[PDB]
Amino acid sequence: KISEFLHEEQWLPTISGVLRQFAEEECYVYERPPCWYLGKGCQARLHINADGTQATFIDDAGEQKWAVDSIADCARRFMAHPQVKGRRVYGQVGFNFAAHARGIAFNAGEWPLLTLTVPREELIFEKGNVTVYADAPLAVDTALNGEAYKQQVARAVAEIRRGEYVKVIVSRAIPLPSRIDMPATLLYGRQANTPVRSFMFRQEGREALGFSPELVMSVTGNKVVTEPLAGTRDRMGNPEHNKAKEAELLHDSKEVLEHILSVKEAIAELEAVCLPGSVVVEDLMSVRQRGSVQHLGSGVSGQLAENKDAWDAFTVLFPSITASGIPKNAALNAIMQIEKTPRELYSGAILLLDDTRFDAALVLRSVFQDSQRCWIQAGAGIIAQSTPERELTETREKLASIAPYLMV
Amino acid sequence: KISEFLHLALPEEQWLPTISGVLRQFAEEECYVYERPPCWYLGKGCQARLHINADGTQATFIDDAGEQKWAVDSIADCARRFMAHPQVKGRRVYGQVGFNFAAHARGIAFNAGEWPLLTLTVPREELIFEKGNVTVYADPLAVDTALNGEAYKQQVARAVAEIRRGEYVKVIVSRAIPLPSRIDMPATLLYGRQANTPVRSFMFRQEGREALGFSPELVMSVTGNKVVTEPLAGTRDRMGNPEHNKAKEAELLHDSKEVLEHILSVKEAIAELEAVCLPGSVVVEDLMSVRQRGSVQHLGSGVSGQLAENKDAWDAFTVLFPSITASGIPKNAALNAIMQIEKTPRELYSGAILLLDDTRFDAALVLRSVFQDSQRCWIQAGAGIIAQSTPERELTETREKLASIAPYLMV
Numbered sequence A: 001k002i003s004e005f006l007h008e009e010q011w012l013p014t015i016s017g018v019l020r021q022f023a024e025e026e027c028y029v030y031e032r033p034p035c036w037y038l039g040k041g042c043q044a045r046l047h048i049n050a051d052g053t054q055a056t057f058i059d060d061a062g063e064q065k066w067a068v069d070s071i072a073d074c075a076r077r078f079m080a081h082p083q084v085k086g087r088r089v090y091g092q093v094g095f096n097f098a099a100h101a102r103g104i105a106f107n108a109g110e111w112p113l114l115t116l117t118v119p120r121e122e123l124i125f126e127k128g129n130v131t132v133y134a135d136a137p138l139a140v141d142t143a144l145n146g147e148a149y150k151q152q153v154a155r156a157v158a159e160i161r162r163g164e165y166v167k168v169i170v171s172r173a174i175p176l177p178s179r180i181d182m183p184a185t186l187l188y189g190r191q192a193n194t195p196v197r198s199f200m201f202r203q204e205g206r207e208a209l210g211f212s213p214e215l216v217m218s219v220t221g222n223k224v225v226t227e228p229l230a231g232t233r234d235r236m237g238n239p240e241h242n243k244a245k246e247a248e249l250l251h252d253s254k255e256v257l258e259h260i261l262s263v264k265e266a267i268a269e270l271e272a273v274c275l276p277g278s279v280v281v282e283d284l285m286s287v288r289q290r291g292s293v294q295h296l297g298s299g300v301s302g303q304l305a306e307n308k309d310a311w312d313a314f315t316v317l318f319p320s321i322t323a324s325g326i327p328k329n330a331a332l333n334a335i336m337q338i339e340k341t342p343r344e345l346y347s348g349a350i351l352l353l354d355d356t357r358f359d360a361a362l363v364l365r366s367v368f369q370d371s372q373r374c375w376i377q378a379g380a381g382i383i384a385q386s387t388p389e390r391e392l393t394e395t396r397e398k399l400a401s402i403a404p405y406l407m408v
Numbered sequence B: 001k002i003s004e005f006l007h008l009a010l011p012e013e014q015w016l017p018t019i020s021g022v023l024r025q026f027a028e029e030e031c032y033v034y035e036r037p038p039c040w041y042l043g044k045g046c047q048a049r050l051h052i053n054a055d056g057t058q059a060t061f062i063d064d065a066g067e068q069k070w071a072v073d074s075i076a077d078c079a080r081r082f083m084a085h086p087q088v089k090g091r092r093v094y095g096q097v098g099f100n101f102a103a104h105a106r107g108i109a110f111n112a113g114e115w116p117l118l119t120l121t122v123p124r125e126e127l128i129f130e131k132g133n134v135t136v137y138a139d140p141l142a143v144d145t146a147l148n149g150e151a152y153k154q155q156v157a158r159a160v161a162e163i164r165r166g167e168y169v170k171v172i173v174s175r176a177i178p179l180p181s182r183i184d185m186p187a188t189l190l191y192g193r194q195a196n197t198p199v200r201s202f203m204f205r206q207e208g209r210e211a212l213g214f215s216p217e218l219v220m221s222v223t224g225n226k227v228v229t230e231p232l233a234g235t236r237d238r239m240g241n242p243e244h245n246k247a248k249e250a251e252l253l254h255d256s257k258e259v260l261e262h263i264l265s266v267k268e269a270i271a272e273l274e275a276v277c278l279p280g281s282v283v284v285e286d287l288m289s290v291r292q293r294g295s296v297q298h299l300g301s302g303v304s305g306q307l308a309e310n311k312d313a314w315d316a317f318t319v320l321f322p323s324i325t326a327s328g329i330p331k332n333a334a335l336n337a338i339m340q341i342e343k344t345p346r347e348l349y350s351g352a353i354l355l356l357d358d359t360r361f362d363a364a365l366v367l368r369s370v371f372q373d374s375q376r377c378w379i380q381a382g383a384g385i386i387a388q389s390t391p392e393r394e395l396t397e398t399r400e401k402l403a404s405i406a407p408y409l410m411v
Ligand SMILES: O=C(O)c1ccccc1O
Pocket: A169, A213, A229, A230, A231, A232, A295, A322, A323, A364, A379, A380, A381
């Protein structure tokens, strides 16, 4: 039921308003051009806890515990539920969803593995209008702790060269001196970036926001698309510098090899769920501009096989190859061996599910805060040809996409 | 034309021998051989020919009514008029396109060789062999590949230095190996084929010029509105045991120099196809997998597209040719570097062989091939030179490739 219809550069500020006017209440914001989506409150929720041992459903009638033998079956059950079907669903998928779904052992973090929410209220910004439906920057030193990171990379490089795996994303968490103003970081960060999706979610005393550089996955009807980005240079100088960096990226043998290794894995992943011969690269290794950095990017698509749904596709595609590694399960393991803080939502997914689409954005270029931690996180794809010093610099170039725009 | 069908109760072992035995009987008549599995098409004589001379200044139609001079304002239009000729419609057409067709099309200045730029021929008689049946329509040289390796190395060095100066990104530098004698074509076909796994095989004789070879890649295939191109680039040997070969395969697939050399050419192929296709129809159906080609294995990708309404197979061919994998990047600068660096005309080397029928426009790249005319008898092979290339490796590469033809040349 459409409540109001008030008649674009005011979209940004309005969302902030909404987040503040109704702060300390649960909110989910998602940008998928030409629209913004803001959901508020909670009419139904599926919550999977940090170690994947409890699935909780909540709606107005109360709380239920659902059998959690398969998180994907829980997600399917939620989407088919009477309180849910026909409604837009805002979701989040933590990094360790992969290990849980994969029968890989893992150490649980603090954040949920998966949540899906039908909001009580919803604003939609489109065609210089909004539709309502109802029932002070901070300085961040991104060099600190550099040497420990380069050791982690040198370890990864040793493991690859020994043949333990081919690629792994090693990331570093940078703790922030104070909690940040999320609505103001959103506004200020956004104008600094050209992301494929933006998001801000506040739920159960935990907050995350970011400018997603790529899609994990998009499903429209029977067509599945994934969008691996891998291979990076800065775009942090004048146009001349940036354009020389673009040509350099296109012709650098290390960056190109990093890229193609991931596209070929993304092809094999889609092949596991798609009709034979339907998997094609629609865009091969073009440069994508993402704020402080520009990347090689490819679009791969296929047609889901008859016995495969968007959740089967999501479990194979998750996490992005470009945020985990190759082969995926060995990389996931190396990540849990090498990294010392839980990724939580970092390298996970933000979801928007509605009548026409399953949309899943990769969680990078993002900032996170709960009762215990406030941090940003960036990594780099490590291959046999990686240099620890260059990969450090790469994380810093990526961190410059979010870090300068953290408002206190 | 009158036709006859024969079932030969011949074992597989004897099929290739029978074909080259028939070729033997065509003695010194003009003829055209093309293998596109499951068939071998042999054409004999000439009923109708389009001839484009070496400098691209004269187009001639020839049939039983005599010679007619056509306007060379557009080779593509000439080729279109020939296909639409009453003499031609409904017949398989055997074509050859010389390296210099590129430069000419692109209004780049070239030095003409002696071979025609392009010819298309409807033969007078035809034989089609397919799995032991035939349909008729009627009315050991020793070659040292190391010799002169030093001169080639300097050509590679010069290309590399030119790339490092930013003149172009990639160029194929090739070397011609003069041969001691004229070769026996039917015996070369027979021995050379069973040692190769080419996309197409060919042999032609026309107006005192001959060529034969085992094409490793298809410039282009068009059936109806769908155009496929299959760029190959990046090489290792497969001259050893299956475990040596499997090692070389994994090594090819993960070598950053080879992977870059491959993808640079694929993206050029994609951009070329996009100029003549429906927006969004150009996709990569097969990304960078290993293809086995006799003495060598290569990375190949399969790219496809849907032709736009204002464009035909002739339009696709003009943009797709020569193979980026035979010229360079950017194409025009690479064609200029090849003309300044190489000392002999390529003629048909790195050109195309065409088989055109009702359904299809099939074009195979001329590499792994042998040429002979009134003046020269030679083989030829090159290598894709990028910033990372070393002259020693690239010489070795030309020799790995030459080994698909050199060992099988018969007198
Ligand atoms: O390492 C990269 O080049 C990269 C770029 C974009 C997204 C994820 C990545 O690992």
